[PDB]
Amino acid sequence: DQRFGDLVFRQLAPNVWQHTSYLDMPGFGAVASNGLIVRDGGRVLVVDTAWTDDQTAQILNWIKQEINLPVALAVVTHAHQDKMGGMDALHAAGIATYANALSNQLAPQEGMVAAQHSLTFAANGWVEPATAPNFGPLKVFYPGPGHTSDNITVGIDGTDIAFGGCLIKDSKAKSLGNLGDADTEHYAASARAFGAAFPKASMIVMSHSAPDSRAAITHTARMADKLR
């Protein structure tokens, strides 16, 4: 693990890093949140911000020191603080930001700064390529409503890695966490759709735990089955 300021970075693959930031909340202690950093040729791609602007700025600075490649774009997975809390740091650095169109619509109600561009999806859940230009190895998939209505997922081509965000919990989880904005009826199917969208991905990266196997997907879905 490499520390830059208040953040921790872990290399998962030759061109993929996991960034981790923490926010201590009154009565709960430190809550960790994970995102991805992906090197694609002569540029860097970012998945999700940190909890805050300051933490997100530390991500960009770390990228400059350890990788020294320009950050071309960033994708955020849904409109919550752990994923979109640091949008300002990205925009301040002049980095193009992308989110689900629904995420951008919900952002002001959620107290988040909207992304500069909106992703739209076909009926099979795959992103409209026109709305996701030059995304490189990033394969964006909308599994359907689960953790939230706008929550999206990202697969990394050329690797065994897929990112489920807050939709997927790890195999040791006892609950699905915050179900405040959740679609309890479609959660299970959405979790399974994510697994089916990236069938070869052996390393599942998620927001609030270390990378797990595919069992995390199935376990999440089966927990979600109990919500129906």
Ligand X SMILES: C[C@@H](O)[C@@H](C(=O)O)[C@@H]1NC(C(=O)O)=C(S[C@@H]2CN[C@H](C(=O)N(C)C)C2)[C@@H]1C
Both structure tokens of 24 = 């201590």
| Residue selected from 40, 82, 170, 212 as contacting Zn ion according to rule CB under 5 A | 82
Q: Does 166 bind ligand X (CB under 6 A)?
A: yes
Residue list 113-172, contact with Zn ion (CB under 5 A): 166
The set of residues, in sequence order, having a beta carbon less than 8 Å from that of 14 and lying 6+ positions away, is: none
Letters for 96-115 (x = contact with ligand X by CB under 6 A, - = none) are --------------------
Q: Coil, strand or helix: which one is 221?
A: helix
- Which of residues 103, 149, 190, 207 is near ligand X by CB under 6 A? 207
Q: What is the 8-class DSSP label of residue 133?
A: T
Q: Is 39 in the site for ligand X (CB under 6 A)?
A: no
Task: Compute the least distance from the CB of residue 82 to ligand X, in Å.
Answer: 4
Own/partner pairs for 221-226, CB < 8 Å, 24+ apart? Answer: 221/188, 221/189, 221/191, 221/192, 221/195, 222/188, 223/169, 223/173, 223/175, 223/176, 224/146, 224/176, 224/184, 224/187, 224/188, 224/191, 225/188
- CA 196 to CA 194: how far, in whole Å? 5
Does position 34 interact with ligand X (CB under 6 A)? The reply is: no
Residue 149, interface with ligand X (CB under 6 A)?
Answer: no
Choose from ligand X, Zn ion, none: what does 31 bind? Cβ within 5-8 Å by kind. ligand X
Determine whether the annotation assigns residue 147 to a binding site.
Answer: yes
80 binds Zn ion (CB under 5 A): yes
Give residues in contact with Zn ion (CB under 5 A). 80, 82, 166, 207
